[PDB]
Amino acid sequence: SREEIFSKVKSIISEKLGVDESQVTEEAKLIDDLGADSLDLVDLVMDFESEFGVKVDDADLEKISTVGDIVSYIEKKL
Ligand SMILES: [Zn+2]
Ligand SMILES: [Zn+2]
Ligand SMILES: [Zn+2]
Ligand SMILES: [Zn+2]
């Protein structure tokens, strides 16, 4: 389930941020490592929301720092 979620999270991030999948690890920080900006994450989250059929709080968005954070947030909602 984590491996499923993480694989799909990684493809979406790679497709939309333009980075190579080899750079998308559990420990990668969206901004610092993968080159995103503070605007990119809300579109990513909505894409994850529609991908897995979950939704996230706007309050819980300020805590999301790494790829692993996204996966874990998704994994807990399902
Ligand atoms: Zn792949
Ligand atoms: Zn895709
Ligand atoms: Zn979107
Ligand atoms: Zn898909």
Author numbering: 3 to 80
Wording from the paper:
To function as a carrier for acyl groups, an apo Tm-ACP should be converted to the holo form, where the phosphopantetheine linker is covalently connected to the side chain of S40 in the conserved DSL motif. Both tertiary structures of the holo and apo forms of Tm-ACP were determined by NMR spectroscopy and X-ray crystallography, respectively (see associated statistics in Table 2). Tm-ACP consists of four α-helices (helix I (4–19), helix II (40–54), helix III (60–65), helix IV (69–80)) connected by a long α1α2 loop and two shorter loops. Compared to the structure of holo Ec-ACP, the helix III of Tm-ACP was found to be protruded outward in both the apo and holo forms. Hyperthermophilic Tm-ACP has nonconserved Glu and Lys residues (D59 and K79), which participate in an ionic cluster between helices III and IV, forcing the outward protrusion of helix III. The Tm-ACP structure has extensive electrostatic interactions in four different regions. The interior of Tm-ACP is filled with numerous hydrophobic side chains, in which three Phe residues and I15 mediate the tight hydrophobic packing. The specific Tm of Tm-ACP was measured as 101.4 °C by DSC, which is the highest melting temperature for any ACP reported to date. For hyperthermophilic Tm-ACP, the distances between the Cα atoms of the corresponding residues, L43, L63, and S67, were increased to 8.6 Å, 7.5 Å, and 9.1 Å, respectively, forming a much larger entrance. This would facilitate the entrance of long acyl chains into the hydrophobic pocket of Tm-ACP.
Acyl carrier proteins (ACPs) are small (~9 kDa) acidic proteins that are essential for numerous biochemical pathways, including the biosynthesis of fatty acids, polyketides, lipopolysaccharides, lipoteichoic acids, rhizobial nodulation signaling factors, and pro-hemolysin toxins. As essential components in type II FAS systems, ACPs shuttle acyl intermediates in their hydrophobic pocket to facilitate interactions with various enzyme partners. ACPs consist of four helical bundles connected by three loop regions, forming hydrophobic cavities to accommodate the growing acyl chains. In this respect, Thermotoga maritima ACP (Tm-ACP) is a valuable target since T. maritima resides in extremely hot hydrothermal vents and is the only bacterium known to grow at temperatures up to 90 °C. Its thermophilic cell membrane is highly enriched in saturated fatty acids with long chain lengths, which help maintain their liquid crystalline states at high temperatures.
